[PDB]
Design a protein around this ligand. Structure first.
Ligand code: 0DY
Ligand code: CA
Ligand code: CA
Ligand code: ZN
Ligand code: ZN
Length: 158
């Protein structure tokens, strides 16, 4: 069970997707972290430059870590479990159409899903869970964490 042994974690958005404004990309990311924050003792702080615990980046195909993206659709992103260096970092497929809407692919929902991995959760077999393996759009305004995921972070931290 890899877990962060620190509660206030920093993050850094190294690059952006042209698809959305910078504000929208940052709001997506911010709200995705809040989701996990309200069900745990974790506190997230954004840094504009520097070494952050969780780096966030939009990459294309081969991007230096031995797990290349695959073009439109398919693999949308991946994250590494808690740890130093690459640990907890999250990568998003730059070749996807990233949206703020119901249209594939909603950046807030994918980000929320990746941050679960970054915090130490694995995929869930519960189809109503965020950590379920396949993407599904769900209303995002006033979105809250499904109960299975709450059970998930709570079991790791408090
Ligand atoms: C190596 C890939 C096969 C797995 C990868 C994964 O689950 N990363 O977290 C992934 O991108 N899975 C896709 C599977 C798919 N295209 O349906 C995905 O949508 N993952 C993210 C996801 C899943 C569930 C909910 C939400 N919001 C997002
Ligand atoms: Ca892809
Ligand atoms: Ca890291
Ligand atoms: Zn990667
Ligand atoms: Zn996943």
């Amino acid at each position: 069970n890899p877990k962060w042994e620190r509660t206030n974690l920093t993050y850094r958005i190294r690059n952006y997707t042209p698809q959305l404004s910078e504000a929208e990309v940052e709001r997506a990311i911010k709200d995705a972290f809040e989701l996990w924050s309200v069900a745990s003792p974790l506190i997230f702080t954004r840094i504009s430059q520097g070494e952050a615990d969780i780096n966030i980046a939009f990459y294309q195909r081969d991007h230096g870590d031995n797990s290349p993206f695959d073009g439109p659709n398919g693999i949308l992103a991946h994250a590494f479990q808690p740890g130093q260096g690459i640990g907890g970092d999250a990568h998003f497929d730059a070749e996807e159409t990233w949206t703020n809407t119901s249209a594939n692919y909603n950046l807030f929902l994918v980000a929320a899903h990746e941050f679960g991995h970054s915090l130490g959760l694995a995929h869930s077999s519960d189809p109503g869970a965020l950590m379920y393996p396949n993407y599904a759009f769900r209303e995002t305004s006033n979105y809250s964490l499904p109960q299975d995921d709450i059970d998930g972070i709570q079991a790791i931290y408090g």
